[PDB]
Design a protein around this ligand. Structure first.
Ligand code: NAG
Ligand code: NAG
Ligand code: CL
Ligand code: CL
Ligand code: NA
Ligand code: NA
Lengths: 20, 181, 20, 20, 21, 21, 21, 181
């Protein structure tokens, strides 16, 4: 049988700064 | 070789559900930054910003995601399996509420020690019938001594402690203390 | 500098009055 | 340089009166 | 320049436990 | 036997800092 | 069957909140 | 005639700079010399033979400049001076740190979003703000992927990116946000 799914990839870097 | 630096944002004491960021800084350039828990088989890998700055994003943490984290960096050049000296452990606490403090009178003014078992907390003291906090100080040490003036001292009192900045974690209120006349 | 952020919620109130 | 966080909020309202 | 004014006071706590008999 | 699927894509990052005045 | 590879990193987060009025 | 050889790349044809890439040339008939062809300069590069019908080339920690159109030819000494096989199909190698961001739009009571780049065979991954884990992800062969949103739970702010299916992952910049009302 095929293996289990691997883990999720890490979380990305933070978003761009908001409007004023 | 020499050990890196590992810090957390927005705080090392957080409520559950908060997004935490671990940042490791190497004192010399590296390729990899491992995050080391105790109890884990292989370390987890930081995401590089620079050769001396990496990040590990803890998405919406849970209580068990707390504990003792360390950072080691390495270069491919060093060879397999070898890492730098391990960074100082960053102790991350994730709880919805902090252990309640004790409020006691200490060994004519009167001093009241609100004492918990956690450092770098803000300690607040309440009088009953008086809405706004009576007194508060930041304490590195896990306790705060509130001095009361003898002639306005009798009354009922409680205290709690909390982290200094949002997202706040608050201690359960201490048991009530009565100062008699 | 801008105004500071709000303070934390206070603790639970004092216990009610002895009733009947 | 933002100002400090405001003071800790007030303690909760006094409890409900005690039971039989 | 100057520090900003202080933050607002926090919200009131949840009400207390029931009284004693 | 065959290896499992690749893990799902990681979450998008934490939201940004607040904007300027 | 051995477990799959980790997923990819996610993309950058969503933009922050507006700054002060 | 001298039918074209087969030409493949490992671990991928799209990689981030610094990745050790291996090229394989396979010939339908036996040969000695396997020659690697990059429009620049005139003279071709040699493979390392492993047998008469398989030769390999190892591109050390590749740079963005080592990317581009490659073909492979094979020859035998008896063919005489300067005679090569029919060239293989172009192997397009792309070496980049980050892929161009896609556009993300809602197609003209269910709602469908399209995430579109320019590059073929990528996974596309749909994200909604406030939710951590990817909404949907699907692999595609066209430069885009359609995702269907239940009209009931459809308004909100969305973003998207795409990536390579296997490690070493190269990710695109994420799209500009898309607000559904
Ligand atoms: C590339 O190969 C060299 C040896 O040829 C090795 O030292 C290095 O670790 C490899 N780099 C990567 C990213 O695999
Ligand atoms: C944590 O980050 C995710 C994005 O990865 C976002 O959806 C979520 O709202 C954030 N949560 C908090 C409490 O900031
Ligand atoms: Cl007195
Ligand atoms: Cl009590
Ligand atoms: Na880009
Ligand atoms: Na996919």
């Amino acid at each position: 049988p095929p293996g289990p799914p691997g883990p999720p990839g890490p979380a990305g870097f933070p978003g761009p700064p908001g409007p004023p | 070789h020499p050990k890196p630096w590992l810090g957390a944002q927005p705080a090392t004491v957080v409520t559950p559900g908060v997004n935490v960021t671990l940042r490791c800084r190497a004192p010399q350039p590296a390729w990899r930054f491992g995050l080391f828990k105790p109890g884990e088989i292989a370390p987890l890998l930081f995401r590089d910003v620079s050769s001396e700055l990496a990040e590990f994003f803890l998405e919406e943490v849970t209580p068990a995601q707390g504990g003792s984290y360390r950072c080691c960096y390495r270069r491919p050049d060093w060879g397999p399996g070898v890492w730098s000296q391990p960074s100082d452990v960053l102790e991350l606490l994730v709880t919805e509420e902090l252990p309640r403090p004790s409020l006691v009178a200490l060994p004519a003014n009167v001093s009241l020690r609100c004492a918990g078992r956690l450092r770098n907390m803000s300690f607040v003291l309440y009088r009953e019938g008086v809405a706004a906090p009576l007194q508060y100080r930041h304490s590195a040490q896990p306790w705060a001594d509130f001095t009361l003036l003898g002639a306005r001292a009798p009354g009922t009192y409680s205290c709690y402690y909390h982290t200094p900045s949002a997202p706040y974690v608050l201690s359960q209120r201490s048991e009530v203390l009565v100062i008699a006349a």
